[PDB]
Each structure stands twice: as C-alpha cells, then as structure tokens.
Write an enzyme that holds these catalytic residues in place. Structure first.
Site, PDB file in Angstrom:
ATOM      1  CG  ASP A 538      19.029  12.267 -49.970  1.00 32.68           C
ATOM      2  OD1 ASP A 538      19.101  13.210 -50.815  1.00 32.68           O
ATOM      3  OD2 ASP A 538      18.026  12.029 -49.271  1.00 32.68           O
ATOM      4  CD  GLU A 735      12.517   8.410 -53.821  1.00 34.06           C
ATOM      5  OE1 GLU A 735      11.959   7.504 -53.141  1.00 34.06           O
ATOM      6  OE2 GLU A 735      13.218   9.307 -53.328  1.00 34.06           O
TER       7      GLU A 735
HETATM    8  C1  LIG Z   1      11.400   1.161 -49.215  1.00 29.87           C
HETATM    9  C2  LIG Z   1      10.926   2.640 -49.263  1.00 29.87           C
HETATM   10  C3  LIG Z   1       9.593   3.014 -49.532  1.00 29.87           C
HETATM   11  C4  LIG Z   1       9.333   4.393 -49.561  1.00 29.87           C
HETATM   12  N1  LIG Z   1       7.962   4.859 -49.797  1.00 29.87           N
HETATM   13  C5  LIG Z   1       7.765   6.318 -49.865  1.00 29.87           C
HETATM   14  C6  LIG Z   1       7.582   6.865 -48.400  1.00 29.87           C
HETATM   15  C7  LIG Z   1       7.852   8.232 -48.067  1.00 29.87           C
HETATM   16  C8  LIG Z   1       7.662   8.731 -46.750  1.00 29.87           C
HETATM   17  C9  LIG Z   1       7.136   7.838 -45.795  1.00 29.87           C
HETATM   18  C10 LIG Z   1       6.837   8.296 -44.329  1.00 29.87           C
HETATM   19  N2  LIG Z   1       5.685   8.669 -44.154  1.00 29.87           N
HETATM   20  C11 LIG Z   1       5.392   9.887 -44.988  1.00 29.87           C
HETATM   21  C12 LIG Z   1       4.003  10.475 -44.857  1.00 29.87           C
HETATM   22  O1  LIG Z   1       4.011  11.726 -45.656  1.00 29.87           O
HETATM   23  C13 LIG Z   1       3.629  10.750 -43.460  1.00 29.87           C
HETATM   24  O2  LIG Z   1       2.218  11.333 -43.322  1.00 29.87           O
HETATM   25  C14 LIG Z   1       3.885   9.588 -42.534  1.00 29.87           C
HETATM   26  O3  LIG Z   1       3.585  10.064 -41.197  1.00 29.87           O
HETATM   27  C15 LIG Z   1       5.384   8.977 -42.650  1.00 29.87           C
HETATM   28  C16 LIG Z   1       5.671   7.881 -41.691  1.00 29.87           C
HETATM   29  O4  LIG Z   1       6.884   8.134 -40.950  1.00 29.87           O
HETATM   30  C17 LIG Z   1       6.824   6.501 -46.122  1.00 29.87           C
HETATM   31  C18 LIG Z   1       7.047   6.009 -47.430  1.00 29.87           C
HETATM   32  C19 LIG Z   1      10.313   5.387 -49.367  1.00 29.87           C
HETATM   33  C20 LIG Z   1      11.611   4.990 -49.095  1.00 29.87           C
HETATM   34  C21 LIG Z   1      12.688   6.078 -48.864  1.00 29.87           C
HETATM   35  C22 LIG Z   1      14.033   5.673 -48.825  1.00 29.87           C
HETATM   36  C23 LIG Z   1      15.024   6.674 -48.614  1.00 29.87           C
HETATM   37  C24 LIG Z   1      14.577   8.007 -48.434  1.00 29.87           C
HETATM   38  N3  LIG Z   1      13.268   8.321 -48.500  1.00 29.87           N
HETATM   39  N4  LIG Z   1      12.320   7.359 -48.723  1.00 29.87           N
HETATM   40  C25 LIG Z   1      11.905   3.634 -49.058  1.00 29.87           C
HETATM   41  C1  LIG Z   2       8.031  11.604 -42.770  1.00 32.64           C
HETATM   42  C2  LIG Z   2       9.369  11.515 -43.550  1.00 32.64           C
HETATM   43  C3  LIG Z   2      10.034  12.686 -43.959  1.00 32.64           C
HETATM   44  C4  LIG Z   2      11.255  12.580 -44.669  1.00 32.64           C
HETATM   45  N1  LIG Z   2      12.021  13.808 -45.078  1.00 32.64           N
HETATM   46  C5  LIG Z   2      13.366  13.638 -45.691  1.00 32.64           C
HETATM   47  C6  LIG Z   2      13.258  13.264 -47.215  1.00 32.64           C
HETATM   48  C7  LIG Z   2      12.424  14.041 -48.021  1.00 32.64           C
HETATM   49  C8  LIG Z   2      12.293  13.796 -49.391  1.00 32.64           C
HETATM   50  C9  LIG Z   2      12.939  12.728 -49.991  1.00 32.64           C
HETATM   51  C10 LIG Z   2      12.806  12.524 -51.552  1.00 32.64           C
HETATM   52  N2  LIG Z   2      13.714  13.066 -52.209  1.00 32.64           N
HETATM   53  C11 LIG Z   2      15.065  12.552 -51.979  1.00 32.64           C
HETATM   54  C12 LIG Z   2      16.049  12.953 -53.035  1.00 32.64           C
HETATM   55  O1  LIG Z   2      17.390  12.373 -52.813  1.00 32.64           O
HETATM   56  C13 LIG Z   2      16.166  14.386 -53.047  1.00 32.64           C
HETATM   57  O2  LIG Z   2      17.136  14.724 -54.099  1.00 32.64           O
HETATM   58  C14 LIG Z   2      14.879  14.952 -53.384  1.00 32.64           C
HETATM   59  O3  LIG Z   2      15.016  16.353 -53.495  1.00 32.64           O
HETATM   60  C15 LIG Z   2      13.758  14.579 -52.346  1.00 32.64           C
HETATM   61  C16 LIG Z   2      12.530  15.172 -52.849  1.00 32.64           C
HETATM   62  O4  LIG Z   2      12.048  14.526 -54.031  1.00 32.64           O
HETATM   63  C17 LIG Z   2      13.755  11.931 -49.166  1.00 32.64           C
HETATM   64  C18 LIG Z   2      13.930  12.178 -47.786  1.00 32.64           C
HETATM   65  C19 LIG Z   2      11.821  11.319 -44.980  1.00 32.64           C
HETATM   66  C20 LIG Z   2      11.151  10.157 -44.616  1.00 32.64           C
HETATM   67  C21 LIG Z   2      11.807   8.795 -44.944  1.00 32.64           C
HETATM   68  C22 LIG Z   2      11.021   7.684 -45.297  1.00 32.64           C
HETATM   69  C23 LIG Z   2      11.726   6.456 -45.518  1.00 32.64           C
HETATM   70  C24 LIG Z   2      13.135   6.432 -45.363  1.00 32.64           C
HETATM   71  N3  LIG Z   2      13.781   7.535 -45.028  1.00 32.64           N
HETATM   72  N4  LIG Z   2      13.123   8.702 -44.815  1.00 32.64           N
HETATM   73  C25 LIG Z   2       9.949  10.258 -43.881  1.00 32.64           C
END
Ligand SMILES: Cc1cc(NCc2ccc(CN3C[C@H](O)[C@@H](O)[C@H](O)[C@H]3CO)cc2)cc(-c2cccnn2)c1
Ligand SMILES: Cc1cc(NCc2ccc(CN3C[C@H](O)[C@@H](O)[C@H](O)[C@H]3CO)cc2)cc(-c2cccnn2)c1
Length: 765
Positions: A538, A735
């Site tokens: 990303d 992750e």
């Molecule tokens: C510090 C930290 C924690 C975690 N936890 C995993 C995560 C994954 C997605 C969600 C969101 N959540 C997903 C649900 O599917 C929805 O039903 C819900 O409505 C929504 C609420 O907006 C919340 C937590 C992910 C990141 C991160 C960092 C960079 C990119 N991606 N993810 C960082």
């Molecule tokens: C509800 C909602 C949806 C989305 N969609 C975007 C998204 C989807 C999946 C990933 C995970 N992952 C990232 C890896 O770098 C990829 O290589 C990989 O293929 C994919 C799949 O494993 C990361 C972001 C992100 C968040 C969220 C939550 C917190 C912070 N930022 N974003 C919340």
C-alpha cells in the site's frame, strides 16, 4: 476422464460452512439456494439481547477468540468460539455424508458450555435461521403436536431443482429449558422451542438479524396491545420468545432458550441418498473426520527441526485449519466503472487529479451476477476474495488438496473479462457489500494486482512433471487430467499476460532511456501521491511525485514470474510459437531489470522516474521492493547482484530484525513514517518468498550456498517463532509483526497469508 473427475469434485465440494463472514452457517456452491446461520446471546434484561446477540464475525474486548481446530472442506471440521460477553465456550462440529445425486448430506452439533465466570442459571437464546432463494422451490416446517411450540425435533421439508427433495431437522437437544409461571404462559406456553415460517423478497433473506428483530419487536408490540405491562412483566426470556407459527415460506426461524449448558444437532438429509442422517451418524462421521485430518496433517505438514514438538503441531493445525476453514462461496453483482475514462490511461504529469475527476463522474454500475469460491484474508475484517492474497493462501492448501486449489484457481479465472482483467477485490452481492463503504466498493478495469496465482500453478506443474483421499490428488495422479486443466486455463493465463503488457506498460521510447529492449518496462496504474494499492504494498515509498515515466521493479519482476510459467505450461501443451515468443520476452526482462532498475551505487534494485530535467533517475528505498528480482526467482545462483542482495537481506542495520525482514530499511528516510504499513513492519508473505529463495540457493552448488543456508536457517526460525509466540500469547494470527518488539499488530484472525508458517515449518521446498 476429465469430465468424470469434474463431476466427482463438483459433488465432493458442493456443501460446506461456506459463510466465513458469520460464526456459523452453511450454503452450497449455488447462488440462489438453501442457507443456514446460527445466532446466540445471553438475556439478563428487557434491553440487552439486541447488544449480546452474535451472528457476523467481529473481534473486540467481548470475544477472547475463535477458529477451526480442524477442517477439510470435503469432510467438515470443528470450530471453537470463546465468547467473554455471553460467558460461553461454543463448539460447532460440521460433517459431510456423501450419497445421492445432489451433493450429499451434512450434520452439525452446536454445544455451548458456560465458562466459570457465567451465572450457572444464565438464560441463552439460540436461533437457527434458514432461508431458501429461487422461484420454483419449497420449504415447510412440519407443525408440532403441542399448542405453543415443539417438545421434540423441528422438521423442515423442502424441495428445489438444485437440491431435489431434502429434510432439515433441528433436534430437541440437551439442556434445561426455563419455564414461566406468568399469565402469558396461558397464550405463549410456559417455554418451548418455537418456529416462525415467513416470506420476504429473495434478495433480502440474507438480512437475518433485522428479520429476526422485526419478529421480536412484533411479539413485544403484541404484549403492549394485550395488557402485559410493568405492573407484572413476563420474564425477559419469555418476552423475547417468538409466538410459534410454523408453515411454508422462504425464511424459517427456529428459536430455543436454554438455562445453563446446552447442545442440539442439525441434520440435513438429501432424499436422493439412502436413509436420512441421524445424531449417531453425526458422532461417527465427526470421529472419523478427526482421525483422517490427523493422518493427512502428519504426512502433508511434517514439521521439521526445531518445530517437531507437539506445541508447534497444535500451532500448525490452528494456522492451517483457519486458512482452509475461511473458504467461502460468494454470489452477486460487483460495482465496476466501465467508462474507461481517458483520464485512467494516466499519460500526463498530475494524472492522479484527472483520475479523481473521472471517478467523480460515478459511471460505476452493478454487473454480474458472478460467483467466487475462494479462501479469505480475515473472517471479521476482510471476508472476501483478494487477488494476490489468494496466490499465497493456495500454497499450503495445494499441499493439502491440489484439486481444491485448482477449483479455486478455476473459480478466480472464470471472472476474467474479454480484455484479461480480474478485479483485485471481489465484493459479490448485497451481503458482501454490507461490510464495505460505497466509496471503497468500485473496481477499476485498469487496476492490476500481483499474479501470485501463477506461483500455485508453478508448484502444480513441478508435481505433475514428478475417494476423498483420491479426489484430493486426481489432477496429479492422472496426467491426462492435469494437462486438460492446463489446456483450458492456458488461454486465460496468456490473456492476463497480454493485458498486463497492454494496460500496465511503462514508457521507454519517449525519454532519454538506453536499454537492451525497447519493449520491457512496467508501471502500476492506480498510484496516488502516497499510495500504490495495486502493487499490494500500500504505502511503500515510490517516486515523488508520481509520474507517467515511473517504472516499477516489482511489476516487471511479476511479468517475469508469468513468462516462466507460460514457458513451462506452453512447453507441456507443445505451444511452440508462444514458447519461443515468451523465451525472447524472458531474455529482455533479464537484461532490462539490470539496465533500468539496478543501482551499482546502492547495491540493489530500485523503481525509476523521470527528473525535472527529463532523464531516467533511480529512486532507491531499501526494502522488499529492492529485493524483487530475487524474491521472484529471476536471478541465476552465481549472480553477483544476488550476492549484494544477500548482504542487504542479512544486514541488521537495514532489513534484518530478530523477528524477520523489515518491509523498509531503518536507514530509509521513510522508515516508521505516515501510516507505517509497509514502511517497517514484518510481513509473512514477502518473508515466505525470501525463505523459499534462500533455500533454493542453499540446496545448489554456487558461491552463496553457505550464506544462503545460514540466512535460510535463521530467517525460517525468526518468522516461525515470531508468529508462534504471538499465537501462544493472544490466540491470533496477525497481518504484520513489529520489528522492535515482535508484537503482532493491525488485523487479527489474519489467515490470511500469515498461515504460510505451516509450509515454512514443513520446509522441503
Ligand atoms: C491499528 C489497526 C487495526 C486494524 N484492525 C483490523 C481492522 C480492519 C477493518 C476495520 C474496519 N471495519 C471493518 C469491518 O469489516 C466493518 O464491518 C466495519 O464497518 C469497519 C469500520 O470502519 C477495522 C479493523 C487494522 C488496521 C489497518 C491499517 C492499515 C490498513 N488496514 N487496516 C490498523
Ligand atoms: C471498512 C474498511 C475497508 C477497507 N478496505 C481497504 C483495505 C482492504 C484490505 C486491506 C488488507 N490488506 C492490505 C494489504 O496491503 C494488501 O496487500 C492486501 O491485499 C489486503 C488484503 O489482505 C487493507 C485495506 C479498509 C479499512 C481500513 C481500516 C483501518 C485503516 N485503514 N483502512 C476499512
């Protein structure tokens, strides 16, 4: 023999718990058919059940953990759910029983055991929710003998074209059933199993929580109308017990209330099979599945030193079973922008602003319907197909069951459009869409993703060149079968290859650029000021600003992976004209990787832009990207370039942490900056490619053999032990892992390419 193996596979895999987005439910590999789901929650008050009730997977303070202890999608398995909020340890055992012409039968045991902190007299509501979609199909609850509900089993009789005739039984179960002494018991019964049989338009049957709550609210409204009030209220569990109305419909709600521990069975009996399924049948098949799962694990995932121990074996079984247990069947429309707006060609400076303007026209429309049979990164967070993730997920699945992995590859490649495009993110149907904001749903036909599914094909080719037991390996044990699979898919592989080279092409001829080939140069479409989402890394730092002149060494390396697969599969199919074209494309990439991407000053590969003064500039950011020709198996084992990458990989001051390789060097200006996603953390998928290539070099005459053997040994140990320690401490695959503390961070239940650890432990690549 290809169409016969086909039918036996179709029928082996038809039924499963293919709803990984929920704690427990079943559906077959058919868009519009019979689906089941489980719900439970404690009831302590008149207002708490709406907050305690469980259905869709989440991860928060109220849930200690959950996952499959064992699973094989041909046979079934066992899930453990540890719920703090509801004070319950639940087991859901699911088993498949072959028979008949309709994909056979299944059964499931739901067992809840209150934990030590739960009140011994806790009231738990359990709902088994059954829906059926389709125009010419029937499902009817057989009415009870008793006035107010069922003392014994609930029988649903149904029929459809796809399933033929079937019965679905929800058994009486074991456990105290609370009894109300209230006046209301004269009209609602003292407390018993109840069934509401209803009808809604097919497309909203998946909305099981709203549908249940609309019936519960209607029951409470009736209490108010009929003078049951706060002077003398019924107990909560009776206020939340539906009025029994079994009948015919496309939704059937089966509700139970238990005091203390409980268990009940679900028995799905395909009429086309012999005798109907019994609870004694369930217990025998569950016992036999465990024995088989055990025997296969020990052969397929023989963990080598120093992970021979039983503690690493339980770990391995948990990471594997949760990865293969995540397999879903998805059906519906996806949201695609089919404008092919010219702003998407990104051939100007500042193209990201133009592409934003084109997006702001919102010409995206629903299309399909599509189906997808695939494993997923995370049940609670990302329960859907991600294209380059699935390449990683299928490496351990293919060991277990190559025929299963090939089904999932077929499923993914059946989505490819006429141009050669598969959407990187498969959000199929309103259920899949519920979990995803509108803004994030739209797929763009110019957006690629790494073609990691080719790596699974590469492993299948090596196997091919060298009745559940039988079906798992029928595509290798019958070489005529393997080849016909490759013959039918090969055109789609070549189409994807051509599509990369037409849509993700970089610009040599237009700049001051000298290189062995005028042709071989690639640039990921879709890049913003801070992100390159299509590469899969990303926020890994790329040229600033983004520029139509950028070239991306990871993308060129992936095209390299593709030609080498096309060589082997073309050779096997005697596609001579193609095999000679690919050979010349491979040779040009080998030369052009050096000419456009090698930095002698920095000792690694680098992306490239064009300057304020219109010349080729390397932009070097030491990390995963820098290693890509090595990670993708493109470098000869005697290459001096390899030797310098081995130095960078081993260098503690750059990439080498005690916990695995850092996404980005501690020396890079962008280490630990911004969202810090791929700017320092340890990612298991890229470490797995590293570990595989160090082993390749280590098991071969050459100058780096011994350096590779040492790095292989230590990196395998670091990665496995890091993921093992976090699993033991928290119950979760994560992750990514912190290179300073070793802590798992971000997304939990990441099985998910983190489960590659099973394969690292088992080695022998
Ligand atoms: C510090 C930290 C924690 C975690 N936890 C995993 C995560 C994954 C997605 C969600 C969101 N959540 C997903 C649900 O599917 C929805 O039903 C819900 O409505 C929504 C609420 O907006 C919340 C937590 C992910 C990141 C991160 C960092 C960079 C990119 N991606 N993810 C960082
Ligand atoms: C509800 C909602 C949806 C989305 N969609 C975007 C998204 C989807 C999946 C990933 C995970 N992952 C990232 C890896 O770098 C990829 O290589 C990989 O293929 C994919 C799949 O494993 C990361 C972001 C992100 C968040 C969220 C939550 C917190 C912070 N930022 N974003 C919340």
């Amino acid at each position: 023999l290809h169409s016969e193996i086909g039918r036996l596979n179709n029928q082996s895999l038809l039924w499963g718990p293919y709803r990984p987005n929920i704690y427990f439910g079943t559906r077959p590999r058919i868009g519009k058919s019979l689906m089941t789901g489980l719900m439970w929650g404690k009831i302590e008050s008149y207002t708490d059940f709406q907050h305690t009730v469980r259905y869709t997977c989440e991860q928060n303070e109220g849930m200690k953990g959950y996952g499959w202890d064992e699973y094989d999608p041909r046979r079934g398995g066992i899930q453990s759910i540890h719920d703090i909020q509801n004070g319950l340890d639940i087991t859901t055992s699911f088993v498949k029983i072959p028979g008949g012409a309709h994909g056979g039968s299944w059964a499931a045991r739901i067992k809840g055991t209150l934990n030590d902190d739960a009140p011994k007299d806790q009231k738990t509501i359990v709902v088994f929710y059954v829906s059926q979609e389709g125009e010419n199909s029937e499902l009817e609850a057989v009415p009870s003998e008793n006035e107010f509900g069922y003392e014994g089993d609930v029988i649903l009789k149904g029929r459809s074209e796809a399933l033929g005739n079937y019965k679905l039984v929800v058994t009486k179960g074991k456990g105290v059933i609370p009894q109300s002494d209230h006046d209301l018991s004269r009209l609602r019964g003292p407390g018993q199993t109840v069934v509401q049989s209803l009808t809604y338009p097919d497309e909203v049957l998946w909305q099981a929580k709203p549908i249940l709550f609309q019936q519960l609210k209607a029951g409470i409204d009736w209490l108010v109308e009929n003078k049951y009030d706060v002077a003398d209220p019924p107990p909560p569990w009776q206020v939340y017990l539906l009025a029994n109305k079994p009948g015919s419909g496309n939704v059937h709600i089966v509700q139970k209330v238990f005091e203390g521990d409980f268990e009940f069975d679900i028995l799905f009996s395909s009429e086309s099979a012999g005798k109907e399924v019994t609870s004694k049948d369930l217990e025998r098949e569950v016992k036999q599945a465990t024995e088989v799962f055990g025997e296969r694990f020990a052969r397929v995932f023989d963990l080598k030193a120093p992970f021979q121990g039983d503690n690493y074996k339980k770990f391995g079984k948990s990471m594997f079973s949760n990865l293969i247990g995540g397999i879903g069947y998805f059906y519906g429309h996806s949201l695609v922008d089919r404008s092919y707006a010219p702003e998407y060609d990104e051939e100007n400076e500042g193209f990201w602003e133009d592409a934003a303007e084109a997006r702001a026209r919102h010409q995206e429309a629903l299309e399909g319907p599509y189906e997808l049979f695939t494993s997923i990164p995370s049940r609670p967070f990302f329960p859907r197909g991600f294209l380059w993730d699935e390449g990683f997920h299928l490496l351990p699945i293919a060991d277990w069951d190559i025929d299963l992995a090939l089904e999932i590859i077929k499923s993914w490649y059946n989505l490819m459009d006429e141009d050669g495009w598969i959407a990187r993110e498969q959000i199929l149907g309103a259920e899949a869409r519920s979990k995803v904001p509108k803004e994030f749903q739209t797929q763009y036909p110019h957006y690629a993703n790494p073609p990691t599914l080719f790596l699974v094909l590469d492993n299948f080719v090596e196997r091919l060149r060298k009745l559940d037991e039988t079906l798992s390996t029928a595509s290798v044990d019958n070489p005529e079968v393997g080849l016909e699979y490759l013959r039918r898919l090969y055109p789609l592989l070549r189409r994807q290859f051509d599509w990369f080279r037409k849509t993700q092409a970089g610009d040599i001829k237009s700049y001051d650029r000298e290189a062995y080939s005028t042709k071989e140069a690639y640039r990921w479409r879709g890049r913003t000021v801070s992100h390159c989402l299509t590469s899969g890394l990303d926020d890994y730092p790329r040229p600033q600003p983004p520029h139509p002149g950028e070239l991306h060494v990871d993308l060129m390396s992936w095209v390299g992976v593709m030609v080498k697969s096309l060589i082997s599969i073309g050779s096997l199919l005697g596609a001579t004209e193609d095999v000679e074209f690919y050979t010349k494309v491979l040779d040009a990439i080998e030369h052009n990787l050096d000419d456009l991407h090698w930095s002698e000053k920095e000792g690694c590969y680098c992306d490239a832009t064009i300057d304020e003064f219109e010349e080729h500039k390397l932009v070097c950011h030491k990390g995963y990207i820098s290693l890509f020709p090595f990670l993708t198996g493109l470098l000869k084992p005697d290459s001096p370039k390899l030797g310098k990458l081995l130095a960078l990989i081993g260098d503690e001051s750059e990439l080498w942490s005690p916990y695995g390789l850092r996404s980005l060097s501690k020396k890079d200006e962008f280490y630990g900056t911004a969202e810090n996603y791929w700017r320092s953390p340890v990612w298991i998928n890229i470490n797995y490619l590293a570990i595989v290539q160090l082993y390749n070099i280590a098991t071969q005459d050459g100058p780096y053999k011994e350096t590779a053997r040492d790095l292989y040994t230590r990196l395998r140990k670091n990665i496995v032990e890091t993921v093992y320690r976090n699993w033991e401490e928290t119950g979760f695959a994560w992750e990514q892992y912190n290179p300073e503390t070793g802590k798992g961070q971000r997304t939990q239940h990441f099985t998910g390419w983190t489960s590659l650890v099973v394969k690292i432990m088992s080695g022998h690549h």
